[PDB]
Amino acid sequence: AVQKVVVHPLVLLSVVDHFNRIGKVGNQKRVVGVLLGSWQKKVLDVSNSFAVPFDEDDKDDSVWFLDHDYLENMYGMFKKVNARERIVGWYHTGPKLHKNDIAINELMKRYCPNSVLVIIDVKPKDLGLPTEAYISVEEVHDDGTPTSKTFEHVTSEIGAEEAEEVGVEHLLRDIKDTTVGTLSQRITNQVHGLKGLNSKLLDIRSYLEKVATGKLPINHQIIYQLQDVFNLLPDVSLQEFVKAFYLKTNDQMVVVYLASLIRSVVALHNLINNKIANRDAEKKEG
Amino acid sequence: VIDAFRLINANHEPRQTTSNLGHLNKPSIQALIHGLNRHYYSITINYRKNELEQKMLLNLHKKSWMEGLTLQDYSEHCKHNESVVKEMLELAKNYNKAVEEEDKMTPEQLAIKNVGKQDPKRHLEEHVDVLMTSNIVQCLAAMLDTVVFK
Amino acid sequence: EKLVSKSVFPEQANNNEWARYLYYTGRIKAIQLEYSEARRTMTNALRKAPQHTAVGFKQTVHKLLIVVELLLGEIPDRLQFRQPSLKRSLMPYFLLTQAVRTGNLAKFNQVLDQFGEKFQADGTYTLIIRLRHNVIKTGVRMISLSYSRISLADIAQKLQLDSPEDAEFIVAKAIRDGVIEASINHEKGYVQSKEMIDIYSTREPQLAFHQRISFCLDIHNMSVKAMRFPPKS
Amino acid sequence: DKKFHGILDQGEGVLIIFDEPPVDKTYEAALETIQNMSKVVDSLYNKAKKLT
Amino acid sequence: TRPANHRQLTFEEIAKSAKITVNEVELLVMKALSVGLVKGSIDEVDKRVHMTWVQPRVLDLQQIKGMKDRLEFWCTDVKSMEMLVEHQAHDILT
Amino acid sequence: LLKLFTTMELMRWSTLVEDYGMELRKGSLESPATDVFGSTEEGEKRWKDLKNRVVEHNIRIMAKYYTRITMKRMAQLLDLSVDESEAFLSNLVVNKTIFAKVDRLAGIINFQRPKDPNNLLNDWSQKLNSLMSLVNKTTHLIAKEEMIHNLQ
């Protein structure tokens, strides 16, 4: 079981390049390829990738073709160039999971038994990470009865080596705004978090509307998870919670007030020094 | 640090100038010593990007939404605040000591006065900034969660 | 009073002007029945007065503060009564405070008869006359501060009053005025002091700290705007 | 002598036993810092005499 | 059935509902907790049970629509706070 | 018996002695007994220790469930007198096996530790984090369902 997948920026940019070139060729919607990488005791590391021929019928979810001979040849060449990287999984730029993904994963499992799928949205109309990691798992039900092969989410993050970090930072002269202070602690979170939460709740609302009207059938597991969520929603009118909240807020504001007092004294010191300097300069000039 | 090169034949000027674009780099002394503008010439490197490349580069550093709203253990937060205030106490003592100076100091001696010795004013400012940021962020996150989650 | 109510004092006024304004407004509020506001404003005035100079202004504000505190029923601090500058001037008020604390109409009348003219000269005779009849307020305050639950007969005995009916009326007057946080209960016949609430759990500390934080931030902003860099002149 | 944290309730013949965090160690540090910065402000007052 | 904000049942109520005397209420609730049907605690002094979680169950379309309405309220609150923060801090974040 | 001692539910000494009293003590010819609970003084001591184990198990279960209980009810459920139950609980608390506070004047046994404001706020934060994770998981399930049922 994978606990985390680390996708390096070179993999993402290579995926973008593959998508762009196949699109320039034309008549395609999703791109597929291999993810070479390495293992670090349940913390994956995807470092490199290469393109692979792939086509699918836009109507039938059973007419798809992946050139495994080309996959093997290119893997041999990549191994000849860098031995420490071995096949770890496959990637596809499709915005969301397709129905052929389990079949493609079964094909790739003959090259990597613990294959990990990474979906890279090259046109992200959202506010969040661009990578979603999935691992194929057998699901046993209680009423759904037949055990199907379903895709299970795995935490994905972006990391980089020193050279990759240097290159990305050099290339990031598009819009650079570090402001690590309260400004960034207000934009990168708070606003972004609330917007993402609203997006997720809107997705849940859309699904619930579809279910209630009758476009989609009922999923007991989804309904159960929603019940658990609504149960977890806390209550903030309890006297004990209110009192604890006020106590902690008072402590934080004590510290804030002391910091502001220090700031004011420093400002006064600077003003006195500046006035001394200006008076001395005027006296000397006179 | 990257550059692009091409050679010069055994001839005159290697290239023709129809703009100022070429003469904007100030070739480095090391390259000039090792043969720049004599056996080879440089070419400007440009980093034109497409929309998807730009978007992916910008999105690389974006964090998960839940990380933004996630709070921070209150025991650890209070411990950090306590530690920094205790440090600020000694820094204030040293600041009082230092303020009494700066009048018995040569105009040149002041600069070298802060060489190998702590600067209470600078450290107090840094601690104030860190404390303000942390506490303001925590309070605002707490209130936002209080409303959002029922 | 009308002019004060209808005019807004400038905030960017010198500390000396602020001291004068605070003293005069406190005088007006003390002549009227606003002792709490008078004491607050006049403490601010004395605080804002210049440290070294302004000896006479300090004496005047101190005398008025003594009288208004006695009227409110507290006891002025004794440190101010021994400062070299305000030593001889405040002796009559020292004796007045002594009598008020050890409430004794004989001593109070003796002090008033002796230093009658100086009170008139300094402008506090009428307030002292009010104190001469509201003296008991201090005794009731001390009883409330000491006892958590006392009988009206015991209050009468301690305050040297007549039958406990007068004590009950006085205590009710004090409770309505807000001098004492207590509730009377005649079905048993005792006055029970209210409990002390946990101020910290309340939002009040947040308000106080927010006020002070805003003040400090304003100080820093104005101290940064006060800077001058003159070489471009 | 502070052997155990508790208080006696005479009349009712009871012994109450409790656990207390008597001090915060942040408020005390804040108070000490306030005193030190009061000294700093005193020194600034002395230094401002040169302005006059 | 009980709303999430109260969710604090009493011994007499459980006895009346389950047709058992008040004494066996404690054992019934303990069996429920042990099996894992409900989560909570028992306060014999006050004669109450504080249920904090009951097992999920299958819901009909009316209850699904109720959940949708609750989600609507939640999303409205989220959007309101997002707008508040953005408007108030536009100066520092442009 | 092993299942009885592994299940987290109250058990009664009288019921145990009635059901397994003879099988574990005298035995039967098909399954012979053991010297664990013989008629000797060692066996008597071991029987007493088993009774103490039953009492401890009951106390642990009624501490896992129960925020406050009365001493009369705890004695009634442990099948011992009030004084004996008090002594047993006090010994357990002193030995640090379980946490309990006896309010003798009111006869209440409190099994919940004091709640610091830090603890309360930490619990609230943990609940919020769990809520966010559950929202993410629900979104993943919804996406899977839409994929499965939307193309056709």
From Swiss-Prot, chain C:
Record key words, sorted: Isopeptide bond, Phosphoprotein, Proteasome, Ubl conjugation
GO annotation, cellular component aspect: cytosol; extracellular exosome; extracellular region; ficolin-1-rich granule lumen; membrane; nucleoplasm; nucleus; proteasome accessory complex
Record has tRNA-binding as a keyword: no
Domain PCI: 19-198
Taxonomic superkingdom: Eukaryota
Positions carrying Phosphoserine: 151, 163
UniProt record, GO biological process: proteasome-mediated ubiquitin-dependent protein catabolic process; regulation of protein catabolic process; ubiquitin-dependent protein catabolic process
Example of a GO MF term: enzyme regulator activity
Function (record text): Component of the 26S proteasome, a multiprotein complex involved in the ATP-dependent degradation of ubiquitinated proteins. This complex plays a key role in the maintenance of protein homeostasis by removing misfolded or damaged proteins, which could impair cellular functions, and by removing proteins whose functions are no longer required. Therefore, the proteasome participates in numerous cellular processes, including cell cycle progression, apoptosis, or DNA damage repair.
Family listed: Belongs to the proteasome subunit S3 family.
Protein name: 26S proteasome non-ATPase regulatory subunit 3
Source species of the chain: Homo sapiens (Human)
UniProtKB/Swiss-Prot annotation, chain D:
Location of the protein in the cell: Nucleus; Cytoplasm, Cytosol
Tissue expression remark: Highly expressed in embryonic stem cells (ESCs). Expression decreases as ESCs differentiate.
Modification(s) after translation: Phosphorylated by AMPK.
Expression induction or repression: By FOXO4; expression in embryonic stem cells (ESCs) is mediated by FOXO4.
TM spans (from-to): none
Function, as annotated: Component of the 26S proteasome, a multiprotein complex involved in the ATP-dependent degradation of ubiquitinated proteins. This complex plays a key role in the maintenance of protein homeostasis by removing misfolded or damaged proteins, which could impair cellular functions, and by removing proteins whose functions are no longer required. Therefore, the proteasome participates in numerous cellular processes, including cell cycle progression, apoptosis, or DNA damage repair. In the complex, PSMD11 is required for proteasome assembly.
Homology family: Belongs to the proteasome subunit S9 family.
Oligomer status and interactors: Component of the 19S proteasome regulatory particle complex. The 26S proteasome consists of a 20S core particle (CP) and two 19S regulatory subunits (RP). The regulatory particle is made of a lid composed of 9 subunits including PSMD11, a base containing 6 ATPases and few additional components.
Protein name: 26S proteasome non-ATPase regulatory subunit 11
Gene that specifies this protein: PSMD11
From Swiss-Prot, chain E:
Domain of life: Eukaryota
Section of the entire sequence shown: 283 to 376 of 376
Family: Belongs to the proteasome subunit S11 family.
Function: Component of the 26S proteasome, a multiprotein complex involved in the ATP-dependent degradation of ubiquitinated proteins. This complex plays a key role in the maintenance of protein homeostasis by removing misfolded or damaged proteins, which could impair cellular functions, and by removing proteins whose functions are no longer required. Therefore, the proteasome participates in numerous cellular processes, including cell cycle progression, apoptosis, or DNA damage repair.
Subunit-structure text: Component of the 19S proteasome regulatory particle complex. The 26S proteasome consists of a 20S core particle (CP) and two 19S regulatory subunits (RP). The regulatory particle is made of a lid composed of 9 subunits including PSMD13, a base containing 6 ATPases and few additional components.
UniProt-recorded name of the protein: 26S proteasome non-ATPase regulatory subunit 13
Modified residues (N6-acetyllysine): 16
From Swiss-Prot, chain F:
The keyword Acetylation appears for this protein: yes
A GO cellular-component term linked to this record: proteasome complex
Record GO biological process: proteasome-mediated ubiquitin-dependent protein catabolic process
Record PTM N6-acetyllysine, positions in chain: 64
Record keywords: Acetylation, Intellectual disability, Isopeptide bond, Proteasome, Ubl conjugation
PCI domain: residues covered: 1-116
Subunit structure: Component of the 19S proteasome regulatory particle complex. The 26S proteasome consists of a 20S core particle (CP) and two 19S regulatory subunits (RP). The regulatory particle is made of a lid composed of 9 subunits including PSMD12, a base containing 6 ATPases and few additional components. Interacts with ERCC6.
Family assignment from sequence similarity: Belongs to the proteasome subunit p55 family.
Disorder named in the UniProt entry: Stankiewicz-Isidor syndrome: A neurodevelopmental disorder characterized by delayed psychomotor development, intellectual disability, behavioral disorders, mild dysmorphism, ophthalmologic anomalies, feeding difficulties, deafness, and variable congenital malformations of the cardiac and/or urogenital systems.
Name of this chain's protein: 26S proteasome non-ATPase regulatory subunit 12
Full-sequence portion shown in this chain: 305 to 456 of 456
